[PDB]
């Protein structure tokens, strides 16, 4: 709903979403056929959304736990053939703050290690490779500076 107007490009829908709140207010049949909603960020949230018909259960999904990031990525990697001797101890601890999609980025990466690839991954360094790819790696550190 922003602050001032006019106008928002989706303002037709931002009225329709509030019309959905009106349908969940004045229309009793809207208690049927539950509707599921999902958003990327709660930065913009309507205070009028509070109701059983309106948004009721609202769950904040944080960055998955280091043990949680290891379980979700193991279910995705159970189909692929991986080199043996996987301790699961280092790959879990090396995962911190990383989103589940960045976990599949390592999972999709771990599926390419079979043939050659041709770069030598060997083993046990596979997970920590694409883990650092997004936020790392120096390079610098020091150079040009102290």
């Amino acid at each position: 709903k922003r602050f001032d107007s006019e106008k928002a490009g989706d303002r037709e829908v931002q009225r329709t979403m509030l019309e959905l709140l009106n349908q969940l207010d004045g229309f009793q049949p809207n208690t049927q056929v539950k509707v599921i909603a999902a958003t990327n960020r709660v930065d913009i949230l309507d205070p009028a959304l509070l109701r059983s018909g309106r948004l009721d259960r609202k769950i904040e999904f944080p960055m998955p736990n280091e043990e949680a990031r290891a379980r979700i990525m193991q279910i995705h990697s159970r189909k692929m053939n991986v080199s043996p001797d996987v301790n699961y101890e280092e790959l879990a601890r090396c995962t911190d703050d990383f989103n589940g999609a960045q976990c599949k980025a390592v999972c999709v990466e771990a599926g390419m290690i079979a043939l050659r690839r041709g770069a030598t991954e060997l083993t046990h360094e596979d997970y920590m490779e694409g883990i650092l790819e997004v936020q790392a790696k120096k390079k610098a550190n020091l150079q040009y500076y102290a």
């Binding site: 106008k7 009106n22 509070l50």
Partner: protein, 353 residues
């Protein structure tokens, strides 16, 4: 078995082709009547011998023939949003006094509405103008849609409902005749009551005019501004509006006249929250030992929709324990937790985004 012969002979009368309808404009003479079809062409045609003087009318819809465009029978004109407006519904009656607060808003909304209906004498003898409109805005608490619509649904056939989705209508659609129609039938059924909810989108200001779609919002505005501040008597009909913030209402709507009485909703109070918990505990079964002050104190600054639905959330946690009658201890758990979870979700109040 002659009913088949009767049914087919009636279908033989169905071989008669249908006619077209139009709106009468004026009349040049007795043999030429100006009529405007729904498509917009205007014809001057004769007439047949089966009609009467009531066919002419001052600009009323008629049915033109498909050959000579002559009029057969006349029918009352309506664009018929109103039957769609009367399709709403709501329990209460009772829901009037169920909210419990504020007591001054409970008694005042009963006066300004019902008193002009039953006792017009107080206005004409004292010589004062009764309020023709009111404004209920939110959401500092609840009761906007509950208290107003309760009197609406209880007033039965006399009421008018307006959803903010019908103002934009359709591409190159005309809502200017809807605003004139909404207040026209408001002058028919009396006292009429009109509800306008979520006007922030359709109340568009002309300061910043976006694209081609902001002017058609201004047209619906100026149609509202003309008849509400008229120059056309609304004195008997009451009007209600609703909005999240009165930022875009402009000095026209913020003024008296078109919007007369602005009553700000107040959040439930510890004294008033004791009454709203009595009506919530009715439908839900509880243990023999219950204390209403426990739920009222543990939940503060919560709207009625928050208290009710979380009290049902306590019942959903009560069915997790499968118990039919459940002590308030399992309630206070689910009531406090889930509600405190709701507080860290939505930012307001007090901070804007």
């Amino acid at each position: 078995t002659k009913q088949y012969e009767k049914s087919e002979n009636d279908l033989k009368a169905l071989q008669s082709v249908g006619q077209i309808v139009g709106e009468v404009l004026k009349q040049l003479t007795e043999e030429k009547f100006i009529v405007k079809a729904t498509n917009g062409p205007r014809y001057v045609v004769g007439c047949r011998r089966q009609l009467d003087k009531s066919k002419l009318k001052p600009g009323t819809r008629v049915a033109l023939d498909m050959t000579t465009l002559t009029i057969m029978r006349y029918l009352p004109r309506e664009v018929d949003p109103l039957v769609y407006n009367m399709s709403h519904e709501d329990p209460g009656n009772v829901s009037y006094s169920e909210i419990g607060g504020l007591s001054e808003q409970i008694r005042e909304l009963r006066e300004v509405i019902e008193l002009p209906l039953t006792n017009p004498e107080l206005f004409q003898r004292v010589g004062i103008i009764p309020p023709k409109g009111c404004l209920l805005y939110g959401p500092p608490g609840t009761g906007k849609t509950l208290l107003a619509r309760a009197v609406a649904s209880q007033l039965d056939c006399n009421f008018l409902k307006v959803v903010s989705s019908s103002i934009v209508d359709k591409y190159i659609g005309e809502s200017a005749r809807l605003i004139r129609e909404m207040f026209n039938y408001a002058r028919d059924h009396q006292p009429c009551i009109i509800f306008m909810d979520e006007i922030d989108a359709i109340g568009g200001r002309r300061f910043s005019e976006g694209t081609s779609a902001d002017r058609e919002i201004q047209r619906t505005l100026m149609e509202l501004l003309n008849q509400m501040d008229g120059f056309d008597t609304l004195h008997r009909v009451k009007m209600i509006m609703a909005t999240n913030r009165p930022d875009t209402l402009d000095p026209a709507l913020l003024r008296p006249g078109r919007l007369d009485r602005k009553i700000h909703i107040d959040l439930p109070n510890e004294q008033a929250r004791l009454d709203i918990l009595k009506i919530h505990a009715g439908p839900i079964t509880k243990h023999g030992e219950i204390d209403y002050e426990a739920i009222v104190k543990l939940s503060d600054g919560f709207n009625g929709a928050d208290l009710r639905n979380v009290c049902t959330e306590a019942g959903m946690f009560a069915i997790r324990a499968d118990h039919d009658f459940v002590v308030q201890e399992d309630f206070m758990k689910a009531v406090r937790k889930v509600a405190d979870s709701k507080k860290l979700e939505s930012k307001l109040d007090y901070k804007p985004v």
